[PDB]
Write an enzyme that holds these catalytic residues in place. Structure first.
Site, PDB file in Angstrom:
ATOM      1  N   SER A 121      31.384 -49.789  -1.129  1.00 12.39           N
ATOM      2  CA  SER A 121      32.252 -48.977  -1.970  1.00 12.39           C
ATOM      3  C   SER A 121      33.591 -48.677  -1.284  1.00 12.39           C
ATOM      4  O   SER A 121      34.346 -49.600  -0.978  1.00 12.39           O
ATOM      5  CB  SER A 121      31.482 -47.708  -2.365  1.00 12.39           C
ATOM      6  OG  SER A 121      32.037 -47.122  -3.504  1.00 12.39           O
ATOM      7  N   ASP A 127      27.287 -51.704 -12.963  1.00  8.69           N
ATOM      8  CA  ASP A 127      27.731 -50.698 -11.995  1.00  8.69           C
ATOM      9  C   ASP A 127      28.660 -49.777 -12.767  1.00  8.69           C
ATOM     10  O   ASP A 127      29.701 -50.229 -13.242  1.00  8.69           O
ATOM     11  CB  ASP A 127      28.441 -51.344 -10.802  1.00  8.69           C
ATOM     12  CG  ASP A 127      28.784 -50.337  -9.686  1.00  8.69           C
ATOM     13  OD1 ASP A 127      29.036 -49.147  -9.963  1.00  8.69           O
ATOM     14  OD2 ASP A 127      28.796 -50.746  -8.513  1.00  8.69           O
ATOM     15  N   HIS A 130      25.335 -48.658  -8.035  1.00  7.25           N
ATOM     16  CA  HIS A 130      26.480 -48.655  -7.120  1.00  7.25           C
ATOM     17  C   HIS A 130      26.063 -48.722  -5.658  1.00  7.25           C
ATOM     18  O   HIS A 130      26.908 -49.012  -4.790  1.00  7.25           O
ATOM     19  CB  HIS A 130      27.331 -47.393  -7.348  1.00  7.25           C
ATOM     20  CG  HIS A 130      28.681 -47.442  -6.695  1.00  7.25           C
ATOM     21  ND1 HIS A 130      29.621 -48.410  -6.988  1.00  7.25           N
ATOM     22  CD2 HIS A 130      29.253 -46.633  -5.769  1.00  7.25           C
ATOM     23  CE1 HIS A 130      30.712 -48.194  -6.275  1.00  7.25           C
ATOM     24  NE2 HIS A 130      30.513 -47.126  -5.520  1.00  7.25           N
TER      25      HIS A 130
HETATM   26  C1  LIG Z   1      28.888 -44.356  -9.325  1.00 11.93           C
HETATM   27  C2  LIG Z   1      29.681 -43.510 -10.320  1.00 11.93           C
HETATM   28  C3  LIG Z   1      29.083 -43.092 -11.524  1.00 11.93           C
HETATM   29  C4  LIG Z   1      29.835 -42.313 -12.442  1.00 11.93           C
HETATM   30  C5  LIG Z   1      31.165 -41.965 -12.161  1.00 11.93           C
HETATM   31  C6  LIG Z   1      31.762 -42.375 -10.952  1.00 11.93           C
HETATM   32  C7  LIG Z   1      31.013 -43.126 -10.030  1.00 11.93           C
HETATM   33  N1  LIG Z   1      31.940 -43.418  -8.868  1.00 11.93           N
HETATM   34  C8  LIG Z   1      31.546 -43.566  -7.450  1.00 11.93           C
HETATM   35  O1  LIG Z   1      30.423 -43.474  -7.098  1.00 11.93           O
HETATM   36  N2  LIG Z   1      32.492 -43.888  -6.418  1.00 11.93           N
HETATM   37  C9  LIG Z   1      33.577 -44.629  -6.590  1.00 11.93           C
HETATM   38  C10 LIG Z   1      34.205 -44.753  -5.370  1.00 11.93           C
HETATM   39  N3  LIG Z   1      33.460 -44.110  -4.494  1.00 11.93           N
HETATM   40  N4  LIG Z   1      32.367 -43.584  -5.107  1.00 11.93           N
HETATM   41  C11 LIG Z   1      33.269 -43.426  -9.476  1.00 11.93           C
HETATM   42  C12 LIG Z   1      33.138 -42.203 -10.335  1.00 11.93           C
END
Ligand SMILES: Cc1cccc2c1N(C(=O)n1ccnn1)CC2
Length: 267
Positions: free
Chosen positions: A94, A216, A245
């Site tokens: 990430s 993702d 993610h």
């Molecule tokens: C998985 C997720 C699910 C729902 C909204 C969000 C995430 N994001 C993150 O994790 N990141 C992105 C960069 N670093 N962490 C972006 C905002």
């Protein structure tokens, strides 16, 4: 040393080749627990925690230094120098993929390869750029963080991790996420989710391996295509049949063999 202690640096395995593993938002080096057993026989493995992780001392979080991703890139270079490492494979999960990219712009000599997991140069949509988020989505996220951090962590973790909402990996990430100091989580969350690295991609020279889950919530597949198209280095993409993610934590059977292939084989 103070900075290896400050970042919970561990060095394990043994090889003529060094691999350095950098974790993403909300987790720590424990995110690599299913990958490291396959590395230690062939490589020297360096694990470290990003400043601001729940495992690190909040006294050391410098809001000025980390209002920019390059503050983390400077930490990574300082770790490499103190370990006397002159060359490594960097595996960046990430945000660490972009931290690794910035560090390679400052010190291209230190990296032979960057393996990206769940990377994105920009999460907010722009003109002819789909990152996956509108500014109103992020604003709702920051407000939920401010309003009730524990409630936000419990709702966010299953969405970030994907898969079964009651899995071991969802519980692990819910825990590390809640262990972050909420003021640091908000500040870092804002810094990361509003970042924009697109402009420096054409100037990378370290070869890059772009890996992500097909599904993702924070990384649409078209982001991996954008990275491949705009990184000035040689690169390769592999979109994994996985959800989430943190796929190296939640889906090791389908993800770890892919990461290993890209570590062990050059473009
Ligand atoms: C998985 C997720 C699910 C729902 C909204 C969000 C995430 N994001 C993150 O994790 N990141 C992105 C960069 N670093 N962490 C972006 C905002």
């Amino acid at each position: 040393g103070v900075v290896e202690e400050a970042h919970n640096v561990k060095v394990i395995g043994s090889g003529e080749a060094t691999i350095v593993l950098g974790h993403g938002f909300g987790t720590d080096q424990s995110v690599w627990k299913h990958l490291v057993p396959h590395l230690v026989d062939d490589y020297r493995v360096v694990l470290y925690d990003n400043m601001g992780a729940g495992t690190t001392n909040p006294d050391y979080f410098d809001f000025d230094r980390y209002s920019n991703l390059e503050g983390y890139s400077f930490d990574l270079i300082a770790i490499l120098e103190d370990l006397k490492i002159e060359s490594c494979i960097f595996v960046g999960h990430s945000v660490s993929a972009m931290i690794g990219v910035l560090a390679s712009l400052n010190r291209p000599d230190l990296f032979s390869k960057i393996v990206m997991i769940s990377a994105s140069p920009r999460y907010v949509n722009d003109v002819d750029y789909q990152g996956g988020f509108e500014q109103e989505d992020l604003n709702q996220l920051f407000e939920a963080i401010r309003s009730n951090y524990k409630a936000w962590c419990l709702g966010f973790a299953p969405l970030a991790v994907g898969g079964d909402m009651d899995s071991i990996a969802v519980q692990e990430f819910s825990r590390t996420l809640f262990n972050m100091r909420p003021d640091i989580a908000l500040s870092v969350g804002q810094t990361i989710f509003q970042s924009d690295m697109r402009q420096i991609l054409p100037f990378v020279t370290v070869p890059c391996h772009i890996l992500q889950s097909v599904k993702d919530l924070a990384v649409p597949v078209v982001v991996s295509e954008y990275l491949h198209a705009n990184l000035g280095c040689e690169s390769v993409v592999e979109v994994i049949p996985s959800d989430g993610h943190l796929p190296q934590l939640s889906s090791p059977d389908s993800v770890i063999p892919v990461i290993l292939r890209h570590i062990r084989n050059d473009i």
